[PDB]
Amino acid sequence: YSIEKLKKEENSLAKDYYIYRLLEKNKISKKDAQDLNSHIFRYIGKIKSELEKINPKYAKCYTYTANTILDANLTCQSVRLNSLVFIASLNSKDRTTLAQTFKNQRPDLTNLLLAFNTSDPMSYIVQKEDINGFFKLYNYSKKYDLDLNTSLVNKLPNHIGFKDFAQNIIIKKENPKFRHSMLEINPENVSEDSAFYLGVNALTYDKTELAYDFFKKAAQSFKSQSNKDNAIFWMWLIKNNEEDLKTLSQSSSLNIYSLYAKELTNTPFPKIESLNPSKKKNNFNMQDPFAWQKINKQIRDANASQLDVLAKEFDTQETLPIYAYILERKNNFKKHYFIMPYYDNIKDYNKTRQALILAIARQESRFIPTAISVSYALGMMQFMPFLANHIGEKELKIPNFDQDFMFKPEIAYYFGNYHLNYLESRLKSPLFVAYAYNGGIGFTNRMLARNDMFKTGKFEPFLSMELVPYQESRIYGKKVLANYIVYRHLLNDSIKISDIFENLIQ
Numbered sequence: 001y002s003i004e005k006l007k008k009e010e011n012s013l014a015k016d017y018y019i020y021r022l023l024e025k026n027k028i029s030k031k032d033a034q035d036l037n038s039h040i041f042r043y044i045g046k047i048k049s050e051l052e053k054i055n056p057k058y059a060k061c062y063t064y065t066a067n068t069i070l071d072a073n074l075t076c077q078s079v080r081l082n083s084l085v086f087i088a089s090l091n092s093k094d095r096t097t098l099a100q101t102f103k104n105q106r107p108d109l110t111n112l113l114l115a116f117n118t119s120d121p122m123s124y125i126v127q128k129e130d131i132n133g134f135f136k137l138y139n140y141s142k143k144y145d146l147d148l149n150t151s152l153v154n155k156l157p158n159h160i161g162f163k164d165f166a167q168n169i170i171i172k173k174e175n176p177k178f179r180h181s182m183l184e185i186n187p188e189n190v191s192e193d194s195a196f197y198l199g200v201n202a203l204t205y206d207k208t209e210l211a212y213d214f215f216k217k218a219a220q221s222f223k224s225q226s227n228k229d230n231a232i233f234w235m236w237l238i239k240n241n242e243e244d245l246k247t248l249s250q251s252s253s254l255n256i257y258s259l260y261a262k263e264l265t266n267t268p269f270p271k272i273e274s275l276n277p278s279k280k281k282n283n284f285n286m287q288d289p290f291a292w293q294k295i296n297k298q299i300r301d302a303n304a305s306q307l308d309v310l311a312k313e314f315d316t317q318e319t320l321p322i323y324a325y326i327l328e329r330k331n332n333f334k335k336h337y338f339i340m341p342y343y344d345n346i347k348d349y350n351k352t353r354q355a356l357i358l359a360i361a362r363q364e365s366r367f368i369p370t371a372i373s374v375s376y377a378l379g380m381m382q383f384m385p386f387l388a389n390h391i392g393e394k395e396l397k398i399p400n401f402d403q404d405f406m407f408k409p410e411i412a413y414y415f416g417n418y419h420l421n422y423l424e425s426r427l428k429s430p431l432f433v434a435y436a437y438n439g440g441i442g443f444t445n446r447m448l449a450r451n452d453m454f455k456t457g458k459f460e461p462f463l464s465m466e467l468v469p470y471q472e473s474r475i476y477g478k479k480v481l482a483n484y485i486v487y488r489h490l491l492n493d494s495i496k497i498s499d500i501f502e503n504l505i506q
Protein backbone atom coordinates (compact mmCIF):
# COMPACT_ATOMS: atom_id res chain seq x y z
CA TYR A 1 0.00 0.00 0.00
CA SER A 2 1.10 3.63 -0.68
CA ILE A 3 1.71 5.92 2.35
CA GLU A 4 -1.34 8.16 1.71
CA LYS A 5 -3.74 5.19 1.68
CA LEU A 6 -2.07 3.87 4.81
CA LYS A 7 -2.52 7.22 6.59
CA LYS A 8 -6.32 6.78 6.35
CA GLU A 9 -6.26 3.64 8.59
CA GLU A 10 -6.48 3.85 12.38
CA ASN A 11 -3.17 3.70 14.31
CA SER A 12 -2.17 0.12 15.24
CA LEU A 13 0.65 -2.40 15.01
CA ALA A 14 -0.61 -3.34 11.53
CA LYS A 15 -0.33 0.27 10.39
CA ASP A 16 3.18 0.63 11.95
CA TYR A 17 4.21 -2.58 10.26
CA TYR A 18 3.28 -1.28 6.79
CA ILE A 19 4.81 2.11 7.54
CA TYR A 20 7.98 0.21 8.47
CA ARG A 21 7.92 -1.76 5.18
CA LEU A 22 7.79 1.53 3.22
CA LEU A 23 10.62 3.12 5.25
CA GLU A 24 12.60 -0.13 4.73
CA LYS A 25 12.53 0.30 0.93
CA ASN A 26 13.33 4.10 1.22
CA LYS A 27 9.86 4.69 -0.26
CA ILE A 28 8.71 7.58 1.95
CA SER A 29 9.73 11.12 0.97
CA LYS A 30 10.48 14.06 3.28
CA LYS A 31 7.15 15.82 2.68
CA ASP A 32 5.25 12.58 3.46
CA ALA A 33 7.39 11.81 6.50
CA GLN A 34 6.79 15.23 8.15
CA ASP A 35 3.39 14.48 9.80
CA LEU A 36 4.16 10.78 10.17
CA ASN A 37 4.77 10.68 13.96
CA SER A 38 1.01 11.25 14.58
CA HIS A 39 0.43 8.08 12.43
CA ILE A 40 2.68 5.74 14.47
CA PHE A 41 1.17 3.61 17.24
CA ARG A 42 4.39 2.44 18.92
CA TYR A 43 7.28 4.82 18.20
CA ILE A 44 9.97 2.53 19.61
CA GLY A 45 12.80 0.52 17.99
CA LYS A 46 13.34 -0.15 14.28
CA ILE A 47 10.56 2.21 13.08
CA LYS A 48 11.83 5.08 15.30
CA SER A 49 15.38 4.63 13.88
CA GLU A 50 14.34 4.40 10.24
CA LEU A 51 12.14 7.54 10.58
CA GLU A 52 14.79 9.77 12.23
CA LYS A 53 16.82 9.42 9.02
CA ILE A 54 14.34 12.17 7.93
CA ASN A 55 12.17 20.92 25.92
CA PRO A 56 13.01 24.66 25.32
CA LYS A 57 12.88 25.37 29.06
CA TYR A 58 16.19 23.44 29.40
CA ALA A 59 17.81 23.88 25.92
CA LYS A 60 20.38 26.49 27.03
CA CYS A 61 21.59 24.07 29.75
CA TYR A 62 22.91 21.76 27.02
CA THR A 63 25.34 24.35 25.60
CA TYR A 64 27.42 23.99 28.79
CA THR A 65 29.99 21.21 28.94
CA ALA A 66 32.10 19.39 31.48
CA ASN A 67 34.58 22.32 31.09
CA THR A 68 31.94 25.11 31.62
CA ILE A 69 29.28 23.61 33.96
CA LEU A 70 30.09 26.02 36.85
CA ASP A 71 29.26 29.10 34.71
CA ALA A 72 25.66 27.79 34.36
CA ASN A 73 22.78 28.94 36.61
CA LEU A 74 21.57 26.66 39.45
CA THR A 75 18.65 25.25 37.39
CA CYS A 76 20.90 24.27 34.46
CA GLN A 77 23.49 22.69 36.79
CA SER A 78 20.64 20.71 38.35
CA VAL A 79 19.40 19.56 34.92
CA ARG A 80 22.76 18.40 33.49
CA LEU A 81 23.62 16.48 36.69
CA ASN A 82 20.70 14.08 36.08
CA SER A 83 23.18 12.22 33.80
CA LEU A 84 25.73 9.87 35.44
CA VAL A 85 27.74 9.83 32.21
CA PHE A 86 27.99 13.62 32.50
CA ILE A 87 28.92 13.42 36.24
CA ALA A 88 31.64 10.90 35.41
CA SER A 89 33.04 13.25 32.72
CA LEU A 90 33.68 16.08 35.25
CA ASN A 91 36.86 16.49 37.26
CA SER A 92 36.94 16.15 41.06
CA LYS A 93 37.43 19.88 41.60
CA ASP A 94 34.06 20.57 39.95
CA ARG A 95 32.29 17.57 41.49
CA THR A 96 33.35 18.74 44.98
CA THR A 97 32.07 22.34 44.43
CA LEU A 98 28.75 21.10 43.03
CA ALA A 99 28.34 18.65 45.94
CA GLN A 100 28.55 21.61 48.36
CA THR A 101 26.08 23.59 46.26
CA PHE A 102 23.55 20.75 46.17
CA LYS A 103 24.06 19.27 49.69
CA ASN A 104 20.84 20.54 51.33
CA GLN A 105 18.51 20.60 48.27
CA ARG A 106 19.64 17.42 46.42
CA PRO A 107 21.46 15.18 48.91
CA ASP A 108 21.26 12.08 46.64
CA LEU A 109 22.95 14.04 43.82
CA THR A 110 25.61 15.20 46.32
CA ASN A 111 26.35 11.54 47.21
CA LEU A 112 26.87 10.51 43.57
CA LEU A 113 29.00 13.60 42.82
CA LEU A 114 31.36 12.70 45.66
CA ALA A 115 31.15 8.96 44.78
CA PHE A 116 32.55 9.71 41.33
CA ASN A 117 35.67 11.26 42.94
CA THR A 118 36.64 7.76 44.05
CA SER A 119 38.01 4.79 42.13
CA ASP A 120 34.85 2.75 43.08
CA PRO A 121 31.68 4.92 43.19
CA MET A 122 29.58 1.88 44.25
CA SER A 123 31.64 1.23 47.41
CA TYR A 124 31.16 4.88 48.35
CA ILE A 125 27.40 4.69 47.80
CA VAL A 126 27.16 1.36 49.66
CA GLN A 127 28.92 2.88 52.68
CA LYS A 128 26.24 5.61 52.70
CA GLU A 129 23.39 3.06 52.19
CA ASP A 130 22.13 5.36 49.46
CA ILE A 131 19.55 3.09 47.82
CA ASN A 132 18.62 5.47 45.01
CA GLY A 133 22.32 5.88 44.17
CA PHE A 134 22.82 2.12 44.33
CA PHE A 135 20.27 1.50 41.50
CA LYS A 136 21.48 4.42 39.37
CA LEU A 137 25.03 3.05 39.61
CA TYR A 138 23.83 -0.48 38.75
CA ASN A 139 22.12 0.95 35.63
CA TYR A 140 25.29 2.92 34.82
CA SER A 141 27.42 -0.24 34.94
CA LYS A 142 26.66 -3.91 35.69
CA LYS A 143 30.36 -4.41 36.45
CA TYR A 144 30.18 -3.17 40.06
CA ASP A 145 30.01 -6.09 42.49
CA LEU A 146 30.76 -6.33 46.21
CA ASP A 147 29.68 -7.94 49.46
CA LEU A 148 26.71 -6.08 50.93
CA ASN A 149 25.81 -6.18 54.64
CA THR A 150 22.49 -7.32 56.09
CA SER A 151 21.32 -3.76 56.80
CA LEU A 152 21.88 -2.63 53.20
CA VAL A 153 20.40 -5.67 51.40
CA ASN A 154 17.22 -5.46 53.47
CA LYS A 155 16.68 -1.86 52.24
CA LEU A 156 17.13 -2.77 48.53
CA PRO A 157 13.64 -4.29 48.12
CA ASN A 158 11.98 -0.95 49.00
CA HIS A 159 12.89 0.37 45.51
CA ILE A 160 10.99 -0.35 42.29
CA GLY A 161 14.23 -1.41 40.56
CA PHE A 162 14.93 -4.32 42.95
CA LYS A 163 12.78 -6.84 41.10
CA ASP A 164 14.58 -6.51 37.74
CA PHE A 165 17.98 -6.12 39.42
CA ALA A 166 17.43 -9.42 41.29
CA GLN A 167 15.84 -11.28 38.34
CA ASN A 168 18.63 -10.17 36.05
CA ILE A 169 21.63 -11.09 38.21
CA ILE A 170 20.03 -14.40 39.31
CA ILE A 171 18.87 -15.73 35.88
CA LYS A 172 22.03 -14.48 34.16
CA LYS A 173 24.25 -15.83 36.99
CA GLU A 174 26.04 -12.46 37.23
CA ASN A 175 27.41 -10.33 40.11
CA PRO A 176 28.28 -13.20 42.50
CA LYS A 177 28.96 -10.97 45.52
CA PHE A 178 25.56 -9.25 45.19
CA ARG A 179 23.83 -12.64 44.75
CA HIS A 180 25.49 -14.15 47.77
CA SER A 181 24.65 -11.06 49.88
CA MET A 182 20.91 -11.46 49.03
CA LEU A 183 20.76 -14.67 51.11
CA GLU A 184 20.44 -12.25 54.08
CA ILE A 185 17.24 -10.57 52.85
CA ASN A 186 14.48 -11.28 55.34
CA PRO A 187 11.44 -12.85 53.56
CA GLU A 188 9.18 -10.39 55.50
CA ASN A 189 10.78 -7.65 53.39
CA VAL A 190 9.81 -9.06 49.95
CA SER A 191 6.70 -10.26 48.08
CA GLU A 192 5.51 -11.51 44.70
CA ASP A 193 8.21 -11.78 41.98
CA SER A 194 11.03 -10.45 44.21
CA ALA A 195 10.29 -13.12 46.84
CA PHE A 196 10.17 -15.81 44.10
CA TYR A 197 13.56 -14.84 42.63
CA LEU A 198 15.16 -14.75 46.08
CA GLY A 199 13.76 -18.28 46.54
CA VAL A 200 15.47 -19.29 43.33
CA ASN A 201 18.71 -17.59 44.48
CA ALA A 202 18.57 -19.46 47.81
CA LEU A 203 18.21 -22.84 46.01
CA THR A 204 21.38 -22.21 43.92
CA TYR A 205 23.37 -21.93 47.20
CA ASP A 206 21.42 -24.97 48.58
CA LYS A 207 19.72 -22.93 51.31
CA THR A 208 16.48 -24.92 51.06
CA GLU A 209 14.63 -23.84 54.24
CA LEU A 210 15.36 -20.18 53.34
CA ALA A 211 14.19 -20.86 49.77
CA TYR A 212 11.00 -22.42 51.14
CA ASP A 213 10.33 -19.28 53.19
CA PHE A 214 10.80 -17.02 50.15
CA PHE A 215 8.53 -19.21 47.97
CA LYS A 216 5.88 -19.31 50.68
CA LYS A 217 5.86 -15.52 50.85
CA ALA A 218 5.51 -15.44 47.03
CA ALA A 219 2.64 -17.96 47.20
CA GLN A 220 0.89 -15.80 49.81
CA SER A 221 1.26 -12.53 47.83
CA PHE A 222 1.07 -13.33 44.08
CA LYS A 223 -2.17 -12.10 42.46
CA SER A 224 -2.14 -14.56 39.55
CA GLN A 225 -3.07 -18.17 40.20
CA SER A 226 -0.43 -19.37 37.72
CA ASN A 227 2.40 -17.63 39.63
CA LYS A 228 0.92 -18.77 42.95
CA ASP A 229 0.96 -22.42 41.62
CA ASN A 230 4.63 -22.06 40.53
CA ALA A 231 5.61 -20.93 44.09
CA ILE A 232 3.51 -23.72 45.76
CA PHE A 233 5.19 -26.29 43.54
CA TRP A 234 8.61 -25.18 44.97
CA MET A 235 7.19 -25.35 48.49
CA TRP A 236 6.28 -28.96 47.71
CA LEU A 237 9.58 -29.87 46.01
CA ILE A 238 11.49 -28.62 49.10
CA LYS A 239 9.47 -30.05 52.07
CA ASN A 240 7.16 -32.67 50.42
CA ASN A 241 4.04 -31.59 52.43
CA GLU A 242 0.94 -33.43 51.07
CA GLU A 243 -1.37 -30.43 51.51
CA ASP A 244 0.79 -28.32 49.11
CA LEU A 245 0.55 -30.97 46.40
CA LYS A 246 -3.23 -31.26 47.06
CA THR A 247 -3.74 -27.46 46.80
CA LEU A 248 -1.71 -27.36 43.59
CA SER A 249 -3.75 -30.30 42.14
CA GLN A 250 -7.03 -28.33 42.76
CA SER A 251 -5.88 -25.16 40.91
CA SER A 252 -8.30 -23.83 38.29
CA SER A 253 -5.24 -22.40 36.51
CA LEU A 254 -4.02 -24.70 33.79
CA ASN A 255 -0.20 -24.65 33.82
CA ILE A 256 2.62 -27.20 33.95
CA TYR A 257 2.66 -27.27 37.77
CA SER A 258 -1.12 -27.78 38.25
CA LEU A 259 -1.05 -30.40 35.45
CA TYR A 260 1.86 -32.27 37.00
CA ALA A 261 0.20 -32.20 40.46
CA LYS A 262 -2.98 -33.68 38.96
CA GLU A 263 -0.93 -36.50 37.38
CA LEU A 264 0.80 -37.22 40.73
CA THR A 265 -2.49 -37.29 42.74
CA ASN A 266 -4.59 -39.14 40.04
CA THR A 267 -6.85 -36.09 39.77
CA PRO A 268 -8.85 -36.03 36.53
CA PHE A 269 -7.59 -33.92 33.62
CA PRO A 270 -9.07 -30.38 33.51
CA LYS A 271 -12.25 -29.72 31.46
CA ILE A 272 -11.43 -28.36 28.00
CA GLU A 273 -14.16 -26.61 26.03
CA SER A 274 -15.09 -27.95 22.61
CA LEU A 275 -15.93 -25.48 19.84
CA ASN A 276 -17.03 -26.61 16.40
CA PRO A 277 -19.18 -24.05 14.56
CA SER A 278 -21.72 -25.42 12.02
CA LYS A 279 -21.21 -22.61 9.54
CA LYS A 280 -17.99 -22.85 7.46
CA LYS A 281 -17.42 -19.21 6.58
CA ASN A 282 -18.94 -15.78 6.31
CA ASN A 283 -17.94 -12.45 4.72
CA PHE A 284 -15.27 -11.45 7.23
CA ASN A 285 -11.76 -11.36 5.76
CA MET A 286 -9.41 -13.29 8.05
CA GLN A 287 -6.40 -12.25 5.90
CA ASP A 288 -7.05 -8.48 6.41
CA PRO A 289 -4.83 -7.22 9.26
CA PHE A 290 -6.63 -3.86 9.58
CA ALA A 291 -9.96 -5.64 10.04
CA TRP A 292 -8.50 -7.66 12.93
CA GLN A 293 -7.12 -4.52 14.68
CA LYS A 294 -10.58 -2.92 14.43
CA ILE A 295 -12.56 -5.95 15.70
CA ASN A 296 -10.04 -6.54 18.53
CA LYS A 297 -10.94 -3.08 19.95
CA GLN A 298 -14.65 -3.72 19.49
CA ILE A 299 -14.35 -6.98 21.45
CA ARG A 300 -12.33 -5.28 24.24
CA ASP A 301 -15.01 -2.57 24.63
CA ALA A 302 -18.08 -4.93 24.53
CA ASN A 303 -20.39 -5.64 27.46
CA ALA A 304 -22.00 -9.16 27.82
CA SER A 305 -24.81 -8.35 25.35
CA GLN A 306 -22.48 -6.95 22.75
CA LEU A 307 -20.23 -10.04 23.19
CA ASP A 308 -23.26 -12.32 22.58
CA VAL A 309 -23.95 -10.47 19.32
CA LEU A 310 -20.27 -10.64 18.28
CA ALA A 311 -20.10 -14.37 19.09
CA LYS A 312 -23.02 -15.02 16.70
CA GLU A 313 -21.33 -12.90 14.01
CA PHE A 314 -18.05 -14.91 14.25
CA ASP A 315 -19.52 -18.38 14.86
CA THR A 316 -17.86 -19.98 11.80
CA GLN A 317 -15.00 -22.43 11.11
CA GLU A 318 -13.09 -19.73 9.17
CA THR A 319 -13.52 -17.20 12.02
CA LEU A 320 -12.99 -19.72 14.87
CA PRO A 321 -9.98 -17.92 16.41
CA ILE A 322 -12.10 -14.77 16.80
CA TYR A 323 -15.06 -16.83 18.10
CA ALA A 324 -12.84 -18.44 20.77
CA TYR A 325 -11.31 -15.00 21.62
CA ILE A 326 -14.86 -13.66 22.15
CA LEU A 327 -15.89 -16.64 24.34
CA GLU A 328 -12.76 -16.39 26.49
CA ARG A 329 -13.83 -12.91 27.45
CA LYS A 330 -17.55 -13.68 27.79
CA ASN A 331 -16.53 -16.42 30.33
CA ASN A 332 -14.04 -14.08 32.08
CA PHE A 333 -11.04 -16.33 31.36
CA LYS A 334 -12.44 -19.11 33.63
CA LYS A 335 -12.90 -21.69 30.84
CA HIS A 336 -10.13 -23.53 28.93
CA TYR A 337 -10.14 -23.01 25.13
CA PHE A 338 -7.74 -25.16 23.08
CA ILE A 339 -9.00 -24.85 19.53
CA MET A 340 -7.71 -26.61 16.40
CA PRO A 341 -8.57 -24.26 13.55
CA TYR A 342 -7.79 -24.80 9.83
CA TYR A 343 -7.15 -28.41 10.87
CA ASP A 344 -7.09 -29.84 7.32
CA ASN A 345 -3.62 -28.28 6.93
CA ILE A 346 -2.11 -30.35 9.79
CA LYS A 347 -4.24 -33.54 9.92
CA ASP A 348 -1.67 -35.59 8.01
CA TYR A 349 1.19 -34.85 10.43
CA ASN A 350 1.51 -37.32 13.30
CA LYS A 351 -0.36 -36.40 16.46
CA THR A 352 2.69 -35.33 18.49
CA ARG A 353 3.78 -32.94 15.74
CA GLN A 354 0.21 -31.62 15.56
CA ALA A 355 0.29 -31.01 19.35
CA LEU A 356 3.59 -29.11 19.09
CA ILE A 357 2.36 -26.92 16.20
CA LEU A 358 -0.94 -26.21 17.99
CA ALA A 359 0.85 -25.53 21.29
CA ILE A 360 3.14 -22.93 19.66
CA ALA A 361 0.32 -21.31 17.64
CA ARG A 362 -1.94 -21.03 20.71
CA GLN A 363 0.75 -19.19 22.70
CA GLU A 364 2.01 -17.06 19.78
CA SER A 365 -1.22 -15.65 18.37
CA ARG A 366 -4.26 -17.42 19.87
CA PHE A 367 -4.54 -18.52 16.20
CA ILE A 368 -5.34 -15.04 14.84
CA PRO A 369 -4.11 -15.27 11.23
CA THR A 370 -3.08 -11.59 11.00
CA ALA A 371 -1.45 -11.36 14.46
CA ILE A 372 1.42 -8.84 14.50
CA SER A 373 3.81 -8.47 17.45
CA VAL A 374 5.67 -5.39 18.62
CA SER A 375 8.75 -6.59 16.69
CA TYR A 376 6.54 -7.35 13.60
CA ALA A 377 6.51 -11.13 13.91
CA LEU A 378 3.72 -12.25 11.60
CA GLY A 379 0.70 -14.50 11.47
CA MET A 380 -0.50 -17.49 13.47
CA MET A 381 2.99 -18.87 13.93
CA GLN A 382 4.61 -15.44 14.56
CA PHE A 383 7.54 -15.64 12.15
CA MET A 384 10.00 -12.79 12.11
CA PRO A 385 10.18 -11.40 8.53
CA PHE A 386 13.86 -12.37 8.17
CA LEU A 387 13.07 -16.04 8.93
CA ALA A 388 9.93 -16.16 6.77
CA ASN A 389 11.92 -14.75 3.83
CA HIS A 390 14.81 -17.13 4.39
CA ILE A 391 12.48 -20.13 4.37
CA GLY A 392 10.27 -18.81 1.54
CA GLU A 393 12.84 -17.27 -0.83
CA LYS A 394 16.02 -19.33 -0.21
CA GLU A 395 15.05 -22.75 1.09
CA LEU A 396 11.66 -23.39 -0.57
CA LYS A 397 11.94 -21.00 -3.57
CA ILE A 398 8.20 -20.22 -3.57
CA PRO A 399 7.32 -18.22 -6.72
CA ASN A 400 6.45 -14.59 -5.98
CA PHE A 401 6.99 -15.06 -2.21
CA ASP A 402 6.20 -12.20 0.12
CA GLN A 403 6.49 -12.20 3.92
CA ASP A 404 2.73 -11.40 4.14
CA PHE A 405 2.12 -15.02 2.99
CA MET A 406 2.61 -15.76 6.76
CA PHE A 407 -0.93 -14.43 7.25
CA LYS A 408 -2.33 -17.42 5.32
CA PRO A 409 -2.89 -20.39 7.64
CA GLU A 410 -1.78 -22.98 5.03
CA ILE A 411 1.59 -21.15 4.83
CA ALA A 412 1.94 -20.44 8.58
CA TYR A 413 1.33 -24.08 9.54
CA TYR A 414 3.61 -25.38 6.72
CA PHE A 415 6.51 -23.00 7.66
CA GLY A 416 5.94 -23.72 11.36
CA ASN A 417 6.24 -27.45 10.68
CA TYR A 418 9.40 -26.90 8.62
CA HIS A 419 11.11 -24.77 11.25
CA LEU A 420 9.94 -26.87 14.23
CA ASN A 421 11.29 -29.93 12.46
CA TYR A 422 14.73 -28.29 12.11
CA LEU A 423 14.67 -27.26 15.82
CA GLU A 424 13.51 -30.69 16.98
CA SER A 425 16.19 -32.49 14.93
CA ARG A 426 18.81 -30.60 17.00
CA LEU A 427 17.13 -30.18 20.44
CA LYS A 428 14.72 -33.16 20.91
CA SER A 429 12.51 -31.96 23.76
CA PRO A 430 9.45 -29.83 23.01
CA LEU A 431 10.57 -27.47 25.84
CA PHE A 432 13.97 -26.84 24.20
CA VAL A 433 12.28 -26.45 20.81
CA ALA A 434 10.00 -23.79 22.40
CA TYR A 435 12.97 -21.86 23.87
CA ALA A 436 14.63 -21.91 20.44
CA TYR A 437 11.44 -20.97 18.54
CA ASN A 438 11.05 -17.82 20.70
CA GLY A 439 14.66 -16.94 21.53
CA GLY A 440 16.74 -18.51 18.77
CA ILE A 441 18.72 -21.75 18.63
CA GLY A 442 21.98 -19.81 19.31
CA PHE A 443 20.94 -18.86 22.87
CA THR A 444 19.43 -22.32 23.48
CA ASN A 445 22.62 -24.14 22.37
CA ARG A 446 24.79 -21.92 24.57
CA MET A 447 22.47 -22.54 27.54
CA LEU A 448 22.46 -26.36 27.12
CA ALA A 449 26.27 -26.41 26.67
CA ARG A 450 26.59 -25.05 30.22
CA ASN A 451 27.72 -27.59 32.81
CA ASP A 452 25.13 -26.23 35.29
CA MET A 453 21.95 -26.20 33.07
CA PHE A 454 19.59 -29.14 32.55
CA LYS A 455 22.03 -31.68 34.06
CA THR A 456 21.49 -34.10 36.96
CA GLY A 457 20.72 -32.49 40.30
CA LYS A 458 18.40 -32.59 43.32
CA PHE A 459 15.71 -30.17 42.03
CA GLU A 460 16.32 -30.74 38.30
CA PRO A 461 15.02 -30.13 35.73
CA PHE A 462 12.78 -27.62 37.57
CA LEU A 463 15.63 -25.41 38.83
CA SER A 464 17.10 -25.04 35.31
CA MET A 465 13.66 -23.91 34.01
CA GLU A 466 13.80 -21.01 36.48
CA LEU A 467 17.34 -20.01 35.33
CA VAL A 468 16.74 -19.75 31.55
CA PRO A 469 18.68 -16.52 31.01
CA TYR A 470 16.11 -14.51 28.91
CA GLN A 471 12.84 -13.77 30.68
CA GLU A 472 10.56 -13.92 27.61
CA SER A 473 11.83 -17.39 26.64
CA ARG A 474 11.81 -18.57 30.27
CA ILE A 475 8.05 -17.82 30.51
CA TYR A 476 7.20 -18.81 26.92
CA GLY A 477 8.66 -22.36 27.31
CA LYS A 478 6.50 -23.08 30.37
CA LYS A 479 3.28 -21.94 28.62
CA VAL A 480 4.02 -23.82 25.41
CA LEU A 481 4.87 -26.98 27.40
CA ALA A 482 1.47 -26.82 29.17
CA ASN A 483 -0.31 -26.29 25.82
CA TYR A 484 1.60 -29.28 24.33
CA ILE A 485 0.41 -31.59 27.16
CA VAL A 486 -3.22 -30.49 26.72
CA TYR A 487 -3.18 -30.85 22.91
CA ARG A 488 -1.51 -34.29 23.21
CA HIS A 489 -4.34 -35.24 25.59
CA LEU A 490 -7.05 -33.86 23.23
CA LEU A 491 -5.61 -35.86 20.34
CA ASN A 492 -5.57 -39.12 22.45
CA ASP A 493 -1.78 -39.08 22.28
CA SER A 494 -1.26 -38.45 26.01
CA ILE A 495 2.23 -38.54 27.50
CA LYS A 496 3.18 -38.82 31.16
CA ILE A 497 4.25 -35.36 32.34
CA SER A 498 6.97 -37.06 34.44
CA ASP A 499 8.50 -38.56 31.25
CA ILE A 500 8.67 -35.09 29.69
CA PHE A 501 10.60 -33.73 32.71
CA GLU A 502 12.88 -36.81 32.84
CA ASN A 503 13.71 -36.28 29.16
CA LEU A 504 15.10 -32.78 30.00
CA ILE A 505 18.09 -34.17 31.99
CA GLN A 506 21.24 -34.59 29.83
Ligand SMILES: CC(=O)N[C@H]1[C@H](O[C@H]2C[C@@H](C(=O)NCCS(=O)(=O)O)[NH2+][C@@H]2CO)O[C@H](CO)[C@@H](OS(=O)(=O)O)[C@@H]1O
Nearest residue numbers: 373374375376377382383384387437438439440441442
Ligand atom coordinates in the same frame (compact mmCIF):
# COMPACT_ATOMS: atom_id res chain seq x y z
C1 LIG B 1 9.70 -18.08 14.47
C2 LIG B 1 10.70 -16.94 14.55
O1 LIG B 1 10.76 -16.09 13.66
N1 LIG B 1 11.47 -16.97 15.64
C3 LIG B 1 12.46 -15.89 15.90
C4 LIG B 1 12.02 -15.18 17.10
O2 LIG B 1 10.74 -14.58 16.87
C5 LIG B 1 9.95 -14.46 18.06
C6 LIG B 1 9.91 -13.04 18.55
C7 LIG B 1 8.71 -13.07 19.45
C8 LIG B 1 8.05 -11.66 19.59
O3 LIG B 1 7.54 -11.09 18.62
N2 LIG B 1 8.04 -11.17 20.84
C9 LIG B 1 7.34 -9.96 21.24
C10 LIG B 1 5.94 -10.50 21.61
S1 LIG B 1 4.74 -9.23 22.15
O4 LIG B 1 4.34 -8.35 20.96
O5 LIG B 1 5.40 -8.45 23.30
O6 LIG B 1 3.48 -9.92 22.64
N3 LIG B 1 7.78 -14.06 18.82
C11 LIG B 1 8.49 -14.76 17.74
C12 LIG B 1 8.27 -16.27 17.73
O7 LIG B 1 8.26 -16.68 19.13
O8 LIG B 1 12.91 -14.12 17.36
C13 LIG B 1 14.20 -14.61 17.78
C14 LIG B 1 15.04 -13.43 18.31
O9 LIG B 1 15.15 -12.55 17.21
C15 LIG B 1 14.81 -15.37 16.61
O10 LIG B 1 16.01 -15.98 17.00
S2 LIG B 1 17.28 -15.83 16.13
O11 LIG B 1 17.23 -16.82 15.00
O12 LIG B 1 18.52 -16.07 16.99
O13 LIG B 1 17.32 -14.45 15.55
C16 LIG B 1 13.85 -16.48 16.19
O14 LIG B 1 14.33 -17.13 15.01
